[PDB]
Write a protein that binds this ligand. Sequence first.
Ligand SMILES: *[C@@H]1O[C@H](CO[C@@H]2O[C@@H](C)[C@@H](O)[C@@H](O)[C@@H]2O)[C@@H](O[C@@H]2O[C@H](CO)[C@@H](O[C@@H]3O[C@H](CO)[C@@H](O)[C@H](O)[C@@H]3O)[C@H](O)[C@H]2NC(C)=O)[C@H](O)[C@H]1NC(C)=O
Ligand SMILES: *[C@@H]1O[C@H](CO[C@@H]2O[C@@H](C)[C@@H](O)[C@@H](O)[C@@H]2O)[C@@H](O)[C@H](O)[C@H]1NC(C)=O
Lengths: 218, 8
Amino acid sequence: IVGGRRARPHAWPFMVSLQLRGGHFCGATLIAPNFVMSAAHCVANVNVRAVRVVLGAHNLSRREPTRQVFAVQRIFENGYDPVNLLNDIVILQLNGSATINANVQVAQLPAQGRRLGNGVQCLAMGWGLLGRNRGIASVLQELNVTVVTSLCRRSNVCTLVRGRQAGVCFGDSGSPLVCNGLIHGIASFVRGGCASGLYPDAFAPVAQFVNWIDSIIQ
Amino acid sequence: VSSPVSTM
Ligand SMILES: *[C@@H]1O[C@H](CO[C@@H]2O[C@@H](C)[C@@H](O)[C@@H](O)[C@@H]2O)[C@@H](O[C@@H]2O[C@H](CO)[C@@H](O[C@@H]3O[C@H](CO)[C@@H](O)[C@H](O)[C@@H]3O)[C@H](O)[C@H]2NC(C)=O)[C@H](O)[C@H]1NC(C)=O
Ligand SMILES: *[C@@H]1O[C@H](CO[C@@H]2O[C@@H](C)[C@@H](O)[C@@H](O)[C@@H]2O)[C@@H](O)[C@H](O)[C@H]1NC(C)=O
């Protein structure tokens, strides 16, 4: 997140860190004790065998005994278009079930077909690049955002912050867009650059796939 | 690629 604020300690207990070596590379969202939702390109050319699904985290710069690391069992995709960046959603099955603590909780999704219009206030998060200076975020980061329809596709849900150069950057892909306590977006791609101020940041449109998510999660 | 897309 560029131009954002630190999150309160585990204020968003559904926030997941997808790690490869020991470094963060994508974020995710816990939608069930044994399921994780993220971005399809986050696993496109990676050995999913080696990805550890870190959950219940705050500062990924050292070890937290409240953190619960998992591995990927099953990978579901509903037609990811790697070139057009369409349907950039993936459901990752867990290895096991997570302890629903105060630090780990199950996020919730909207209904199939729910479209947010321009003007709706949303919130983005991620451990991605920390902003202008300073790289990957050591501490989860927050950012108030508003939905835009201009310079966007309904094959996405788009987000702009008006009056400042701020928005999602590299490493935030797969992280959720919370709108009224509902997960409406998955961080897919930016245009021209992260906090460009002219091109809207694009999220994967969760509401278009819920019926598909419910067939895996139920 | 920028205006084509810049997947993070
Ligand atoms: C930035 O976003 C945070 C997160 O809450 C957001 O609320 C909506 C506007 C949507 O954007 C959601 O997607 C998102 O979760 C805002 O924090 C929220 O602040 C408001 C006002 O301070 C809180 O509402 C109050 O709730 C209390 C009871 O808790 C009432 O008594 C008040 O009358 C008032 O309604 C809200 O609870 C709080 N949400 C959370 C999760 O803490 C933040 O305000 C927003 N910033 C800006 C500038 O809009
Ligand atoms: C989840 O799986 C963990 C296994 O660790 C990892 O396993 C494979 C997938 C590789 O990524 C390997 O490099 C790792 O060591 C276990 O530690 C953990 O206990 C498993 N979860 C449960 C609930 O048993």
